[PDB]
Ligand binder design. Structure first.
Ligand code: C14
Ligand code: C14
Ligand code: C14
Ligand code: C14
Ligand code: C14
Ligand code: C14
Ligand code: C14
Ligand code: C14
Ligand code: C14
Ligand code: C14
Lengths: 55, 55
């Protein structure tokens, strides 16, 4: 289960977050720029949890 | 002068107007859709003036 969850997380998200996201889904016209909340703290916590899982 | 003005108008605009315009100039992000005012009456008047100039 540990390995499966780690692989799924790696495939879907990764281990980092960026502040700006580009969206190309309807009904948005041709493109849209969107902005996230607290994109730096969450990376730190993600890394912490990754280390715990590996241990 | 008549011929020169007709050629310039043909090169720059044409002889019609569309209701939706696509803009890709900064600072607009990646693209923008814009909408015009009275895009059908102006075509009629443009055609009238073209006919007058040719006559
Ligand atoms: C341990 C339980 C994990 C559940 C696995 C079921 C498959 C998860 C989705 C796989 C990715 C889907 C991409 C479209
Ligand atoms: C700029 C942010 C870079 C983050 C990339 C992911 C780094 C993962 C670090 C893993 C180190 C710990 C391994 C045991
Ligand atoms: C964009 C820069 C992000 C900075 C990442 C620093 C993460 C530090 C995590 C340390 C985890 C240690 C686990 C024992
Ligand atoms: C500023 C760039 C930071 C690059 C990522 C930092 C996290 C990697 C170190 C992880 C600590 C591991 C402790 C066991
Ligand atoms: C991030 C990966 C951590 C791996 C180290 C985990 C501790 C293993 C200790 C090895 C010594 C075994 C003594 C019983
Ligand atoms: C009869 C007076 C007409 C003036 C002609 C001067 C040139 C007009 C501009 C030509 C097109 C410029 C495209 C960058
Ligand atoms: C759907 C709008 C079509 C407009 C295209 C321009 C047509 C020009 C008509 C010229 C006819 C008169 C020539 C003497
Ligand atoms: C998109 C459809 C626009 C309809 C264009 C009709 C223009 C009629 C102009 C007639 C001019 C006659 C000059 C004598
Ligand atoms: C509905 C489509 C209309 C196509 C353009 C109509 C304008 C062309 C006729 C111009 C009249 C010329 C009179 C001398
Ligand atoms: C749209 C172009 C109009 C061209 C016709 C202009 C009238 C020319 C009449 C030709 C007969 C000459 C008799 C002197």
């Amino acid at each position: 289960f540990e390995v499966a969850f780690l692989l799924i997380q790696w495939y879907i998200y990764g281990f980092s977050l960026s502040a700006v996201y580009t969206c190309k889904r309807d009904p948005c016209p041709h493109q849209v720029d969107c902005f996230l909340s607290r994109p730096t703290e969450k990376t730190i916590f993600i890394i912490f949890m990754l280390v715990v899982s590996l241990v």
